[PDB]
Subunit: 99 residues, 4 copies
């Protein structure tokens, strides 16, 4: 459940490429999203919410109007997990739709 | 209120082009949407929900898993008003983001 | 999977008490909810939608402004399953808070 | 409409009373909510989201699973206003409906 560099090295890339980035002193990824508006932003969170509930993996996230910042780290391992990756992947599917 | 003639025959045609039909036995229009899953189906509903509350115009919708069926009519006038109109168009635009 | 009669007799009453009721032409439970407004109704759909997804069991539902009708049946058995019942149980919980 | 000092005294009270706080640094009130789970947490955001939109007054909130931090201030007049107040009040009703 914890990211071994081989994994990181194979997983991280596609995310990094679209904007994901690792933080300092904490094993987690972050990304800022910026929609045109709230309708879109919320709709975007809603779909994420559904899935989060579906996989039992939650994001750390902030919102103001049309911006949403997301942070992903798994609680047990206390860093990244295959879980962060998928959620993230999923998130990406959703973001592009609105945009 | 109560779209007259011309407008009707100015405004609706665009909606019909897009699959909107006229309800038989009521002054309404309706259309059904089919999505890949519920995640899309609900997310779609939410965004339409924020808008409805915002305009103070609510649809009559039915949902099952990935299908969403929508009826639009104005209760005040017991029929199609421009309210319905705009809502539909917005709904269409939302449609597109997920379809 | 499909409820036996012993089963129905065990689970049903509690729901029947509350206001749920078998359908006439089919093996499902129905219940119509009424709220003060849309905010509330939509709010309540949101909580069940989350729940619906968590356990992959969805409802046939209908909404207009502040009313919500919910029909439950486990499709795969083509009638009542436990799913329907748990779900119904949950819908009851959500419903009581917005009282 | 950056609320007067007279105005503050009359409105804040009920708010102050419930745990709402004023921030040093900026004209804004804040509050941290805690729920039993994400479902509630999210069902909560949703109702709020609906009001936010209706009003055209959005929050600055962060969520991580079951708690949500809310920050209200009015961009328009760079400080607290009748709105943040109204809104905040509303947030409180919604919160109550969460068990
Ligand atoms: C039991 C535990 O609450 C559950 O497995 C969850 N864990 C986590 C979660 N979300 C994150 N980010 N990390 C977790 O460890 N949501 C659900
Ligand atoms: C005051 C009133 O109930 C409010 O403006 C609403 N009107 C309407 C509505 N929805 C419809 N379809 N028609 C209305 O006239 N939802 C909200
Ligand atoms: C694949 C299938 O659509 C999926 O397993 C679902 N099944 C069911 C469902 N909801 C109910 N009530 N019953 C099901 O059998 N929603 C999701
Ligand atoms: C046009 C303008 O962006 C709009 O009226 C909004 N204003 C505000 C808002 N949110 C806050 N907190 N303050 C505002 O002045 N969300 C929407």
């Amino acid at each position: 459940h914890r990211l071994s560099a081989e994994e990181r090295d194979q997983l991280l890339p596609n995310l990094r490429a679209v904007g994901w980035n690792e933080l300092e002193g904490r094993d987690a990824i972050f990304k800022q999203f910026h929609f045109k508006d709230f309708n879109r932003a919320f709709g975007f969170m809603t779909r994420v919410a559904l899935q989060a509930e579906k996989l039992d993996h939650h994001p750390e996230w902030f919102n103001v109007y049309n911006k949403v910042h997301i942070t992903l780290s798994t609680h047990e391992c206390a860093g990244l997990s295959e879980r962060d990756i998928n959620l993230a992947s999923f998130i990406e599917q959703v973001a592009v739709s609105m945009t």
